[PDB]
Amino acid sequence: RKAAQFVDLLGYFSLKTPQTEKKLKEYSQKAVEILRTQNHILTNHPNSNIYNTLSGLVEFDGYYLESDPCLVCNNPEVPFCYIKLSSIKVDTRYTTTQQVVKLIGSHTISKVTVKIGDLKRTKMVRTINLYYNNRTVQAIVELKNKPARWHKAKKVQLTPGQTEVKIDLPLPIVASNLMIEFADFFLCNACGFCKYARFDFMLYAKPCCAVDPIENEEDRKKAVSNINTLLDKADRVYHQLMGHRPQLENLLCKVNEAAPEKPTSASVNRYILQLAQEYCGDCKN
C-alpha cells in the first residue's frame, strides 16, 4: 500500500507522453501480467476461504492468520502525541540543581513544552540543559553519575519571568532516561520540593521500539541472550496463534450450513457470535 503515489505518477506520465504502438503494447502487457499473477495468488491462498467467508459476517481490519508476519502491514505510520511526563514516569530522583527521570520504555521525543507555576521573584532559572540516554537501568541512583552516561540534547536560555518555554528538538531523539539541569540562576534532595517555583513538563512523543546500544563485548553477549529469549517467546506465541485455525474452520463449516436455530444483540446466530469472538477477540490479540 506504499505505492499509491508511484502508480499515480506512472499512470499520469503514460497518459501524457505520446508513444509508439510497441511501447503501448509492452506497457499494457506488463500491467495485465501483474494483475493476472496477483489474481492467481489470491484465489489459491491457503487462508483465502477463511477470509472470504469472514468478510461478509464480521468487521475486521487486518489478516491475523499469516504464517510470516509482514513488516509492511505490521508497521503503520504512528503519529506524534502530547504526553505528560508524569504519566510515563516510573522512578525519579532529585538533587540540589538537577532532576533525573526514567520512563516506562523508549520514546521518540520531538518537542518539550515546560510550564512554570507559583513562581517567586527570589530566584528563577536562566539556562536549562536537557540530557537523554537510551540505556535501561533498574535504579535511578545507579544512573545518577553525571559525566559518562549522558548526551547533550539542548541548552535553552530564558528571559526573566518566563512561564512557558518551547524546547524544540531539530532531530527527534530516542530516549529512555532523561535529565534536566539548571545551569544558571533550589530543590529538596530527599523529596524534590521546590519553594521558588513549580515545574511541569510536556512531551511531543510517540512510542518507539528500540534497544540499548552495543559498545563492547559483554553487551554483545547480553544482546545475543536477549534475542534468544525473544525468539523463544515469539515461537511460543506463534504456535499459540496457529492453534486457532482448526476451530475457525469448524465454525465456518457449521455456519455454512445455516440451519435455523430457535432461541436484539443476543438474537444473532450463536455460531456467528462465536466466529466473531474467536477471530476479532483472540486471534487479534
B/e letters for 57-81, b = 16+ CB within 10 Å, e = fewer, are beeeeeebbeeeeeeeeeeeeeeee
Among all chains, which residue has been given the C-alpha cell 520540593?
193
CA distance 109 to 132: 10
Least Å from the CB of residue 8 to another protein: 5
Least Å from the CB of residue 280 to another protein: 4
Rg (alpha carbons) of the chain, rounded to whole number:
28
| DSSP label of 282 | I
Between residues 201 and 271, which has the closer beta carbon with respect to another protein? 271
4 binds another protein (CB under 8 A): yes
- Contact stretch for another protein (CB under 8 A) within 117-125, 164-172, 211-219, 252-260: 252-260
137 binds another protein (CB under 8 A): no
CA distance 147 to 10: 54
For residue 98, the cross-strand partners are 181
Size of the site for another protein (CB under 8 A): 32
Encoded one letter per residue, x for contact with another protein by CB under 8 A and - for no contact, window 7-36 reads -xx-xx--x---------------------
What the block records as the C-alpha cell of 118 is 507559583
Other CB atoms closer than 10 Å to residue 229's CB: what's the count? Answer: 10
Between residues 15 and 71, which has the closer beta carbon with respect to another protein? 15
- Contact stretch for another protein (CB under 8 A) within 3-11, 93-101, 137-145, 216-224: 3-11
- Contact stretch for another protein (CB under 8 A) within 19-27, 49-57, 86-94, 189-197: 49-57
Q: How far apart are the first and last CA of the chain?
A: 23
285 binds another protein (CB under 8 A): no
38 binds another protein (CB under 8 A): no
Among all chains, which residue has been given the C-alpha cell 505505492?
3
What is the binding site for another protein (CB under 8 A)?
A: 4, 8-9, 11-12, 15, 43, 49, 52-53, 55-61, 253, 256-257, 259-260, 264-265, 267-268, 272-273, 276-277, 280-281
